[PDB]
Write a protein that binds this ligand. Structure first.
Ligand SMILES: *C(=O)[C@H](CCSC)NC=O
Ligand SMILES: [Mg+2]
Ligand SMILES: [Mg+2]
Ligand SMILES: [Mg+2]
Ligand SMILES: [Mg+2]
Ligand SMILES: [Mg+2]
Ligand SMILES: [Mg+2]
Ligand SMILES: [Mg+2]
Ligand SMILES: [Mg+2]
Ligand SMILES: [Mg+2]
Ligand SMILES: [Mg+2]
Ligand SMILES: [Mg+2]
Ligand SMILES: [Mg+2]
Ligand SMILES: [Mg+2]
Ligand SMILES: [Mg+2]
Ligand SMILES: [Mg+2]
Ligand SMILES: [Mg+2]
Ligand SMILES: [Mg+2]
Ligand SMILES: [Mg+2]
Ligand SMILES: [Mg+2]
Ligand SMILES: [Mg+2]
Ligand SMILES: [Mg+2]
Ligand SMILES: [Mg+2]
Ligand SMILES: [Mg+2]
Ligand SMILES: [Mg+2]
Ligand SMILES: [Mg+2]
Ligand SMILES: [Mg+2]
Ligand SMILES: [Mg+2]
Ligand SMILES: [Mg+2]
Ligand SMILES: [Mg+2]
Ligand SMILES: [Mg+2]
Ligand SMILES: [Mg+2]
Ligand SMILES: [Mg+2]
Ligand SMILES: [Mg+2]
Ligand SMILES: [Mg+2]
Ligand SMILES: [Mg+2]
Ligand SMILES: [Mg+2]
Ligand SMILES: [Mg+2]
Ligand SMILES: [Mg+2]
Ligand SMILES: [Mg+2]
Ligand SMILES: [Mg+2]
Ligand SMILES: [Mg+2]
Ligand SMILES: [Mg+2]
Ligand SMILES: [Mg+2]
Ligand SMILES: [Mg+2]
Ligand SMILES: [Mg+2]
Ligand SMILES: [Mg+2]
Ligand SMILES: [Mg+2]
Ligand SMILES: [Mg+2]
Ligand SMILES: [Mg+2]
Ligand SMILES: [Mg+2]
Ligand SMILES: [Mg+2]
Ligand SMILES: [Mg+2]
Ligand SMILES: [Mg+2]
Ligand SMILES: [Mg+2]
Ligand SMILES: [Mg+2]
Ligand SMILES: [Mg+2]
Ligand SMILES: [Mg+2]
Ligand SMILES: [Mg+2]
Ligand SMILES: [Mg+2]
Ligand SMILES: [Mg+2]
Ligand SMILES: [Mg+2]
Ligand SMILES: [Mg+2]
Ligand SMILES: [Mg+2]
Ligand SMILES: [Mg+2]
Ligand SMILES: [Mg+2]
Ligand SMILES: [Mg+2]
Ligand SMILES: [Mg+2]
Ligand SMILES: [Mg+2]
Ligand SMILES: [Mg+2]
Ligand SMILES: [Mg+2]
Ligand SMILES: [Mg+2]
Ligand SMILES: [Mg+2]
Ligand SMILES: [Mg+2]
Ligand SMILES: [Mg+2]
Ligand SMILES: [Mg+2]
Ligand SMILES: [Mg+2]
Ligand SMILES: [Mg+2]
Ligand SMILES: [Mg+2]
Ligand SMILES: [Mg+2]
Ligand SMILES: [Mg+2]
Ligand SMILES: [Mg+2]
Ligand SMILES: [Mg+2]
Ligand SMILES: [Mg+2]
Ligand SMILES: [Mg+2]
Ligand SMILES: [Mg+2]
Ligand SMILES: [Mg+2]
Ligand SMILES: [Mg+2]
Ligand SMILES: [Mg+2]
Ligand SMILES: [Mg+2]
Ligand SMILES: [Mg+2]
Ligand SMILES: [Mg+2]
Ligand SMILES: [Mg+2]
Ligand SMILES: [Mg+2]
Ligand SMILES: [Mg+2]
Ligand SMILES: [Mg+2]
Ligand SMILES: [Mg+2]
Ligand SMILES: [Mg+2]
Ligand SMILES: [Mg+2]
Ligand SMILES: [Mg+2]
Ligand SMILES: [Mg+2]
Ligand SMILES: [Mg+2]
Ligand SMILES: [Mg+2]
Ligand SMILES: [Mg+2]
Ligand SMILES: [Mg+2]
Ligand SMILES: [Mg+2]
Ligand SMILES: [Mg+2]
Ligand SMILES: [Mg+2]
Ligand SMILES: [Mg+2]
Ligand SMILES: [Mg+2]
Ligand SMILES: [Mg+2]
Ligand SMILES: [Mg+2]
Ligand SMILES: [Mg+2]
Ligand SMILES: [Mg+2]
Ligand SMILES: [Mg+2]
Ligand SMILES: [Mg+2]
Ligand SMILES: [Mg+2]
Ligand SMILES: [Mg+2]
Ligand SMILES: [Mg+2]
Ligand SMILES: [Mg+2]
Ligand SMILES: [Mg+2]
Ligand SMILES: [Mg+2]
Ligand SMILES: [Mg+2]
Ligand SMILES: [Mg+2]
Ligand SMILES: [Mg+2]
Ligand SMILES: [Mg+2]
Ligand SMILES: [Mg+2]
Ligand SMILES: [Mg+2]
Ligand SMILES: [Mg+2]
Ligand SMILES: [Mg+2]
Ligand SMILES: [Mg+2]
Ligand SMILES: [Mg+2]
Ligand SMILES: [Mg+2]
Ligand SMILES: [Mg+2]
Ligand SMILES: [Mg+2]
Ligand SMILES: [Mg+2]
Ligand SMILES: [Mg+2]
Ligand SMILES: [Mg+2]
Ligand SMILES: [Mg+2]
Ligand SMILES: [Mg+2]
Ligand SMILES: [Mg+2]
Ligand SMILES: [Mg+2]
Ligand SMILES: [Mg+2]
Ligand SMILES: [Mg+2]
Ligand SMILES: [Mg+2]
Ligand SMILES: [Mg+2]
Ligand SMILES: [Mg+2]
Ligand SMILES: [Mg+2]
Ligand SMILES: [Mg+2]
Ligand SMILES: [Mg+2]
Ligand SMILES: [Mg+2]
Ligand SMILES: [Mg+2]
Ligand SMILES: [Mg+2]
Ligand SMILES: [Mg+2]
Ligand SMILES: [Mg+2]
Ligand SMILES: [Mg+2]
Ligand SMILES: [Mg+2]
Ligand SMILES: [Mg+2]
Ligand SMILES: [Mg+2]
Ligand SMILES: [Mg+2]
Ligand SMILES: [Mg+2]
Ligand SMILES: [Mg+2]
Ligand SMILES: [Mg+2]
Ligand SMILES: [Mg+2]
Ligand SMILES: [Mg+2]
Ligand SMILES: [Mg+2]
Ligand SMILES: [Mg+2]
Ligand SMILES: [Mg+2]
Ligand SMILES: [Mg+2]
Ligand SMILES: [Mg+2]
Ligand SMILES: [Mg+2]
Ligand SMILES: [Mg+2]
Ligand SMILES: [Mg+2]
Ligand SMILES: [Mg+2]
Ligand SMILES: [Mg+2]
Ligand SMILES: [Mg+2]
Ligand SMILES: [Mg+2]
Ligand SMILES: [Mg+2]
Ligand SMILES: [Mg+2]
Ligand SMILES: [Mg+2]
Ligand SMILES: [Mg+2]
Ligand SMILES: [Mg+2]
Ligand SMILES: [Mg+2]
Ligand SMILES: [Mg+2]
Ligand SMILES: [Mg+2]
Ligand SMILES: [Mg+2]
Ligand SMILES: [Mg+2]
Ligand SMILES: [Mg+2]
Ligand SMILES: [Mg+2]
Ligand SMILES: [Mg+2]
Ligand SMILES: [Mg+2]
Ligand SMILES: [Mg+2]
Ligand SMILES: [Mg+2]
Ligand SMILES: [Mg+2]
Ligand SMILES: [Mg+2]
Ligand SMILES: [Mg+2]
Ligand SMILES: [Mg+2]
Ligand SMILES: [Mg+2]
Ligand SMILES: [Mg+2]
Ligand SMILES: [Mg+2]
Ligand SMILES: [Mg+2]
Ligand SMILES: [Mg+2]
Ligand SMILES: [Mg+2]
Ligand SMILES: [Mg+2]
Ligand SMILES: [Mg+2]
Ligand SMILES: [Mg+2]
Ligand SMILES: [Mg+2]
Ligand SMILES: [Mg+2]
Ligand SMILES: [Mg+2]
Ligand SMILES: [Mg+2]
Ligand SMILES: [Mg+2]
Ligand SMILES: [Mg+2]
Ligand SMILES: [Mg+2]
Ligand SMILES: [Mg+2]
Ligand SMILES: [Mg+2]
Ligand SMILES: [Mg+2]
Ligand SMILES: [Mg+2]
Ligand SMILES: [Mg+2]
Ligand SMILES: [Mg+2]
Ligand SMILES: [Mg+2]
Ligand SMILES: [Mg+2]
Ligand SMILES: [Mg+2]
Ligand SMILES: [Mg+2]
Ligand SMILES: [Mg+2]
Ligand SMILES: [Mg+2]
Ligand SMILES: [Mg+2]
Ligand SMILES: [Mg+2]
Ligand SMILES: [Mg+2]
Ligand SMILES: [Mg+2]
Ligand SMILES: [Mg+2]
Ligand SMILES: [Mg+2]
Ligand SMILES: [Mg+2]
Ligand SMILES: [Mg+2]
Ligand SMILES: [Mg+2]
Ligand SMILES: [Mg+2]
Ligand SMILES: [Mg+2]
Ligand SMILES: [Mg+2]
Ligand SMILES: [Mg+2]
Ligand SMILES: [Mg+2]
Ligand SMILES: [Mg+2]
Ligand SMILES: [Mg+2]
Ligand SMILES: [Mg+2]
Ligand SMILES: [Mg+2]
Ligand SMILES: [Mg+2]
Ligand SMILES: [Mg+2]
Ligand SMILES: [Mg+2]
Ligand SMILES: [Mg+2]
Ligand SMILES: [Mg+2]
Ligand SMILES: [Mg+2]
Ligand SMILES: [Mg+2]
Ligand SMILES: [Mg+2]
Ligand SMILES: [Mg+2]
Ligand SMILES: [Mg+2]
Ligand SMILES: [Mg+2]
Ligand SMILES: [Mg+2]
Ligand SMILES: [Mg+2]
Ligand SMILES: [Mg+2]
Ligand SMILES: [Mg+2]
Ligand SMILES: [Mg+2]
Ligand SMILES: [Mg+2]
Ligand SMILES: [Mg+2]
Ligand SMILES: [Mg+2]
Ligand SMILES: [Mg+2]
Ligand SMILES: [Mg+2]
Ligand SMILES: [Mg+2]
Ligand SMILES: [Mg+2]
Ligand SMILES: [Mg+2]
Ligand SMILES: [Mg+2]
Ligand SMILES: [Mg+2]
Ligand SMILES: [Mg+2]
Ligand SMILES: [Mg+2]
Ligand SMILES: [Mg+2]
Ligand SMILES: [Mg+2]
Ligand SMILES: [Mg+2]
Ligand SMILES: [Mg+2]
Ligand SMILES: [Mg+2]
Ligand SMILES: [Mg+2]
Ligand SMILES: [Mg+2]
Ligand SMILES: [Mg+2]
Ligand SMILES: [Mg+2]
Ligand SMILES: [Mg+2]
Ligand SMILES: [Zn+2]
Lengths: 99, 53, 64
RNA sequence: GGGGGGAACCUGGGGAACUGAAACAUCUCAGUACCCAGAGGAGAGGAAAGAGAAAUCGACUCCCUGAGUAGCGGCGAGCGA
RNA sequence: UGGUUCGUGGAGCCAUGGGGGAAUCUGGGCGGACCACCGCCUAAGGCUAAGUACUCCGGGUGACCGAUAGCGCACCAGUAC
RNA sequence: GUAGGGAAACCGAGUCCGAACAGGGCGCAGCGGCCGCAAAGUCCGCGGCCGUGGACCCGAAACCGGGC
RNA sequence: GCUGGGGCUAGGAGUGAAAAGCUAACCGAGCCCGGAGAUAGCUGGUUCUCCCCGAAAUGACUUUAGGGUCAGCCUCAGGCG
RNA sequence: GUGGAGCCUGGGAGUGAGGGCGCGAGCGAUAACGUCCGCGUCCGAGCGCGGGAACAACCGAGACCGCCAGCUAAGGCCCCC
RNA sequence: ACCCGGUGAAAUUGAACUGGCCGUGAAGAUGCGGCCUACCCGUGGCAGGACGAAAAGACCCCGUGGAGCUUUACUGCAGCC
RNA sequence: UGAAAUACCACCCUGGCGCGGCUGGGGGCCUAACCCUCGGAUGGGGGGACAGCGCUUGGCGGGCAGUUUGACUGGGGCGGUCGCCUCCUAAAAGGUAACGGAGGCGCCCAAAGGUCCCCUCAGGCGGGACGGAAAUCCGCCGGAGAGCGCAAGGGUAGAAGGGGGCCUGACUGCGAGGCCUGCAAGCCGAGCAGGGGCGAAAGCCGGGCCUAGUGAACCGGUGGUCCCGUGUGGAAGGGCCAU
């Protein structure tokens, strides 16, 4: 409240899709985990394992991002960034896209 | 702006998109305005013609 | 009970990663025919709310 | 066999206003207060003409969470799965 | 018109005061206007423990009160007035 | 909490605007000898203040419901 | 005309040879209990001690003007130097 | 120039009725213990202390406590004193 | 009414050891200054003062307070077409 | 002789009726619903498919209901005022009040915009048919007292004034850095890219000598975009850009 005048907030304009009934469109969601967050794993990383380890959150598909250095692992992810694909490939890694 | 000095749009005569808003005095300038203006869609200078706002 | 998110702010405003508040520039909703391209163009960007108004808004968005 | 009673609780039939929106009418308060009918040791609900996206689940009730999310809103105050 | 988060909104769904008014599975309802496709379910009869609520009543226990406190009442109080 | 940017599709240490390899907005980043401390962050306690409730206490004139 | 006894009409309602009169000793809307701790940007009031610092009564906007929001001015913690 | 100076981040405010005086203007009547701004001051919050007979804001002066010690300030030094 | 025997209230009330003048003071002083005047305590009387008592001014203004009333204010509702 | 040859056939335009269909209106009568009535009631009389009543349409509607009915203000009312620009007050930086002293704005310009080229005023005196204080012409003087759309102020001919040619930068995408400032706004802006205008070129051009000519957000319209699209493809509806 601002003493009766139009407030700072109500004078800014709205922007963007706000949605409408019946609500949120159900669509697949992706969380990104970086190569740096994978160095603690030996062998084969999967969405199961990362969800356990407190990295990936439940109800999210797994996308590998490129911050960090790639370790020669068999990584099974729903999606990969371009940098994550180059780094992992050029390091003895096995990218396994899936659905 | 007024009743004799009206607001108007310039429509690119090639891709039919309105790129500019401007004004004229339709008593002094009854003819539709024709002005070469740069069209961002055609990415070239193009003839633009007055359409109604 | 728990705080409710002010939906007017949620629909106008974003809290950036470092905790600034960004909004759209006011003044290009209408009456634009005689505004230069510079005015239209610059009013099409986001800006950063002054600090006193940003703190008040962020309090209205407790679960962002 | 019914009638009438029972502190609260319950279901159904009706159903305000102050107040809040720093005025006010939509909105809020609230299907709350209260009136009435009925029930019982509980009452309601209940065995999909369901959910809703999972090629999935599998009556209903109740707690936690989902979530102040989705949305609803003089897109205001607020309301809210 | 009501119910739902849904205030007419693209407004479906559930309910129904008024008008019109079917079919019996190759029948019908739903998946948020509508249409196709693909699926889910079987309306217009009824019943159904438990887990849930409450505290007139009994008991147990308090980093509850201790006669201006604690129930309005420790006492012949819903009394005297 | 560990990723952000974008209305979004989406991309991602970037991203958005853009025709751009332009420019800009918003983002991105340990001390001492591998042991040790420390630190994101998060949990609980304590304290200040804020939001919702009567919300520091007492006070209207009034409005509404059901009765007398 | 006055008067006893027996009756009927009441709260946005009665009754009124009309005064907004009267409706149980205050009626421009009775009383009681309830919503209820209504709301009161107003007035009042706010309880032990010591120590350090220490304001303002301006600006902008405000159905604002004895009320607010931000800035100014006070204080505390951490940092800089 | 090391000061209860300054700058940065953050927690907590209060204030948003001022008033007197000096100087500078406006309004007023070269009126008001008038009114409205500007610079400054004091009272406000120093209604603690000395002087001005008495007396917030004029002169002197910023009260941590004690002393039956000394110097000064304004102002005083015939008596009240 | 007064005096004696019997019985014996009240509003009000910061405390009081409660004079006049001329000044001063928030602008009308028993309470400050200066001067004047004044032995202690009552009883019957009078009302000039204690800005005497009573009643949180009815006038007046202010509150985005209330209520009654009006209309070609707004928006509804009964009713009527 | 036709713009249009004539017979018959045909599809049709403007009409006119005859039949058939669905429709909708009025009028007359009937009785049996419904309503009223009748000492007699499965009946008689009257009204009559109207009226009443149900759902729905629009209308009149202080009879009643909820409310609104601004602020500033040398008390309130009445009057005046309310945003923006210019000058003064304003105490030679900026800022600075009163219901202090004076004015103006709510537009306008398709050139009154860009660039290149060229030109220089007002006024005074003298000369000149109609012709005047002032029309147009000539000479001399004349630094700006003219002009710059409109208030005022600043500025200005070493042009911002007057004339002409070609033009549309009255750009698209950005924007270092600042002015101002409580916020939000407002203002100035070099430079880079795209594609242009003018110029031989240097260069200039993102409207106008400058400061008034204005309105946050919500709600909705239109043109694009093709971003979302409630099982899926579409669509409905949104988003974004422009207005
Ligand atoms: C003026 O006469 C006033 C009237 C009071 S009652 C109308 N008197 C005192 O205020
Ligand atoms: Mg306003
Ligand atoms: Mg959303
Ligand atoms: Mg334009
Ligand atoms: Mg024009
Ligand atoms: Mg584009
Ligand atoms: Mg036109
Ligand atoms: Mg709640
Ligand atoms: Mg909103
Ligand atoms: Mg946003
Ligand atoms: Mg727009
Ligand atoms: Mg316009
Ligand atoms: Mg312009
Ligand atoms: Mg422009
Ligand atoms: Mg601009
Ligand atoms: Mg753009
Ligand atoms: Mg917060
Ligand atoms: Mg918060
Ligand atoms: Mg959350
Ligand atoms: Mg009974
Ligand atoms: Mg019973
Ligand atoms: Mg109940
Ligand atoms: Mg019910
Ligand atoms: Mg009920
Ligand atoms: Mg009712
Ligand atoms: Mg209400
Ligand atoms: Mg109300
Ligand atoms: Mg409330
Ligand atoms: Mg209110
Ligand atoms: Mg209020
Ligand atoms: Mg009100
Ligand atoms: Mg209300
Ligand atoms: Mg409501
Ligand atoms: Mg309530
Ligand atoms: Mg409700
Ligand atoms: Mg049980
Ligand atoms: Mg049961
Ligand atoms: Mg069955
Ligand atoms: Mg279920
Ligand atoms: Mg199955
Ligand atoms: Mg089954
Ligand atoms: Mg969650
Ligand atoms: Mg609400
Ligand atoms: Mg809601
Ligand atoms: Mg609702
Ligand atoms: Mg509700
Ligand atoms: Mg529900
Ligand atoms: Mg509905
Ligand atoms: Mg509902
Ligand atoms: Mg509804
Ligand atoms: Mg609906
Ligand atoms: Mg359907
Ligand atoms: Mg149905
Ligand atoms: Mg029905
Ligand atoms: Mg079937
Ligand atoms: Mg079928
Ligand atoms: Mg159905
Ligand atoms: Mg379904
Ligand atoms: Mg569907
Ligand atoms: Mg189903
Ligand atoms: Mg079944
Ligand atoms: Mg059923
Ligand atoms: Mg049962
Ligand atoms: Mg049960
Ligand atoms: Mg309990
Ligand atoms: Mg017990
Ligand atoms: Mg016991
Ligand atoms: Mg005890
Ligand atoms: Mg006792
Ligand atoms: Mg007791
Ligand atoms: Mg005792
Ligand atoms: Mg006690
Ligand atoms: Mg008891
Ligand atoms: Mg008691
Ligand atoms: Mg007892
Ligand atoms: Mg007794
Ligand atoms: Mg986002
Ligand atoms: Mg793009
Ligand atoms: Mg870039
Ligand atoms: Mg970048
Ligand atoms: Mg950067
Ligand atoms: Mg910690
Ligand atoms: Mg706080
Ligand atoms: Mg409460
Ligand atoms: Mg209270
Ligand atoms: Mg509190
Ligand atoms: Mg009311
Ligand atoms: Mg009322
Ligand atoms: Mg009643
Ligand atoms: Mg009675
Ligand atoms: Mg009688
Ligand atoms: Mg009689
Ligand atoms: Mg009698
Ligand atoms: Mg009687
Ligand atoms: Mg009667
Ligand atoms: Mg009666
Ligand atoms: Mg009443
Ligand atoms: Mg009543
Ligand atoms: Mg009446
Ligand atoms: Mg009489
Ligand atoms: Mg009584
Ligand atoms: Mg009584
Ligand atoms: Mg009486
Ligand atoms: Mg009376
Ligand atoms: Mg009276
Ligand atoms: Mg009343
Ligand atoms: Mg009433
Ligand atoms: Mg009353
Ligand atoms: Mg009475
Ligand atoms: Mg009584
Ligand atoms: Mg009661
Ligand atoms: Mg009750
Ligand atoms: Mg209540
Ligand atoms: Mg309360
Ligand atoms: Mg109260
Ligand atoms: Mg009120
Ligand atoms: Mg108040
Ligand atoms: Mg009090
Ligand atoms: Mg007090
Ligand atoms: Mg200190
Ligand atoms: Mg100090
Ligand atoms: Mg003031
Ligand atoms: Mg100040
Ligand atoms: Mg002020
Ligand atoms: Mg006011
Ligand atoms: Mg006032
Ligand atoms: Mg006022
Ligand atoms: Mg006061
Ligand atoms: Mg006030
Ligand atoms: Mg403040
Ligand atoms: Mg400071
Ligand atoms: Mg601070
Ligand atoms: Mg420090
Ligand atoms: Mg220091
Ligand atoms: Mg200091
Ligand atoms: Mg300091
Ligand atoms: Mg300081
Ligand atoms: Mg600071
Ligand atoms: Mg700070
Ligand atoms: Mg504090
Ligand atoms: Mg505190
Ligand atoms: Mg204050
Ligand atoms: Mg104020
Ligand atoms: Mg002052
Ligand atoms: Mg001062
Ligand atoms: Mg003043
Ligand atoms: Mg003064
Ligand atoms: Mg004085
Ligand atoms: Mg003076
Ligand atoms: Mg002097
Ligand atoms: Mg002046
Ligand atoms: Mg004189
Ligand atoms: Mg004065
Ligand atoms: Mg004076
Ligand atoms: Mg004076
Ligand atoms: Mg002063
Ligand atoms: Mg004070
Ligand atoms: Mg002093
Ligand atoms: Mg003093
Ligand atoms: Mg003093
Ligand atoms: Mg004082
Ligand atoms: Mg004194
Ligand atoms: Mg003294
Ligand atoms: Mg003194
Ligand atoms: Mg003295
Ligand atoms: Mg003196
Ligand atoms: Mg003095
Ligand atoms: Mg002094
Ligand atoms: Mg001196
Ligand atoms: Mg000291
Ligand atoms: Mg000292
Ligand atoms: Mg000496
Ligand atoms: Mg001396
Ligand atoms: Mg002397
Ligand atoms: Mg002497
Ligand atoms: Mg003496
Ligand atoms: Mg003496
Ligand atoms: Mg002596
Ligand atoms: Mg005697
Ligand atoms: Mg005696
Ligand atoms: Mg006696
Ligand atoms: Mg007494
Ligand atoms: Mg005393
Ligand atoms: Mg004494
Ligand atoms: Mg004496
Ligand atoms: Mg005495
Ligand atoms: Mg005496
Ligand atoms: Mg005086
Ligand atoms: Mg005196
Ligand atoms: Mg005396
Ligand atoms: Mg004394
Ligand atoms: Mg004295
Ligand atoms: Mg004395
Ligand atoms: Mg004396
Ligand atoms: Mg004396
Ligand atoms: Mg004397
Ligand atoms: Mg006597
Ligand atoms: Mg006497
Ligand atoms: Mg006497
Ligand atoms: Mg007397
Ligand atoms: Mg007497
Ligand atoms: Mg007297
Ligand atoms: Mg008095
Ligand atoms: Mg008197
Ligand atoms: Mg008195
Ligand atoms: Mg008194
Ligand atoms: Mg009172
Ligand atoms: Mg009073
Ligand atoms: Mg009174
Ligand atoms: Mg009166
Ligand atoms: Mg009055
Ligand atoms: Mg007054
Ligand atoms: Mg009043
Ligand atoms: Mg007010
Ligand atoms: Mg009022
Ligand atoms: Mg009323
Ligand atoms: Mg009333
Ligand atoms: Mg009604
Ligand atoms: Mg007939
Ligand atoms: Mg007939
Ligand atoms: Mg017949
Ligand atoms: Mg018949
Ligand atoms: Mg007949
Ligand atoms: Mg008959
Ligand atoms: Mg008959
Ligand atoms: Mg008949
Ligand atoms: Mg009919
Ligand atoms: Mg109809
Ligand atoms: Mg109607
Ligand atoms: Mg009316
Ligand atoms: Mg009325
Ligand atoms: Mg009527
Ligand atoms: Mg009435
Ligand atoms: Mg109004
Ligand atoms: Mg109003
Ligand atoms: Mg006023
Ligand atoms: Mg005033
Ligand atoms: Mg006046
Ligand atoms: Mg004045
Ligand atoms: Mg006066
Ligand atoms: Mg006055
Ligand atoms: Mg007037
Ligand atoms: Mg204003
Ligand atoms: Mg304006
Ligand atoms: Mg100046
Ligand atoms: Mg000046
Ligand atoms: Mg400045
Ligand atoms: Mg002032
Ligand atoms: Mg002037
Ligand atoms: Mg203007
Ligand atoms: Mg042109
Ligand atoms: Mg000449
Ligand atoms: Mg001549
Ligand atoms: Mg001549
Ligand atoms: Mg000039
Ligand atoms: Mg002119
Ligand atoms: Mg003019
Ligand atoms: Mg030309
Ligand atoms: Mg030219
Ligand atoms: Mg050309
Ligand atoms: Mg162009
Ligand atoms: Mg900048
Ligand atoms: Mg700014
Ligand atoms: Mg401007
Ligand atoms: Mg270029
Ligand atoms: Mg070029
Ligand atoms: Mg060229
Ligand atoms: Mg060139
Ligand atoms: Mg440029
Ligand atoms: Mg230009
Ligand atoms: Mg020009
Ligand atoms: Mg707007
Ligand atoms: Mg709105
Ligand atoms: Mg919109
Ligand atoms: Mg479109
Ligand atoms: Mg698509
Ligand atoms: Mg779909
Ligand atoms: Mg298809
Ligand atoms: Mg698709
Ligand atoms: Mg759209
Ligand atoms: Mg679209
Ligand atoms: Zn084009």
């Amino acid at each position: 409240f601002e003493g009766g005048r139009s407030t700072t907030l109500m004078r800014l304009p709205k922007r963007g899709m706000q949605g409408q009934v019946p609500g949120e469109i159900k669509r697949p969601r992706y969380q990104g985990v970086n190569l740096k967050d994978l160095a603690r794993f030996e062998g084969e990383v999967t969405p199961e394992l990362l969800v356990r380890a407190g990295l990936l959150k439940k109800g999210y598909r797994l996308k590998i991002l490129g911050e960090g250095e790639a370790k020669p692992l068999k990584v099974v992810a729903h999606a990969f960034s371009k940098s994550a694909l180059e780094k992992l490939k050029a390091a003895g890694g096995e990218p396994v896209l899936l659905e | 702006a007024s009743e004799v000095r009206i607001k108007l749009l310039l429509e690119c005569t090639e891709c039919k998109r309105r790129n500019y808003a401007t004004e004229k005095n339709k008593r002094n300038t009854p003819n539709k305005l024709e002005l070469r203006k740069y069209c961002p869609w055609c990415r070239k200078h193009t003839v633009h013609r007055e359409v109604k706002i | 009970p728990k705080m409710k998110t002010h939906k007017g702010a949620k629909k106008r405003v974003k809290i950036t990663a470092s905790g600034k508040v960004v909004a759209m520039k006011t003044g290009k909703r209408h009456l634009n025919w005689q505004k230069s391209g510079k005015e239209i163009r610059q009013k099409g960007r986001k800006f950063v709310l002054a600090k006193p108004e940003a703190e008040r808004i962020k309090l209205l968005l407790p679960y962002e």
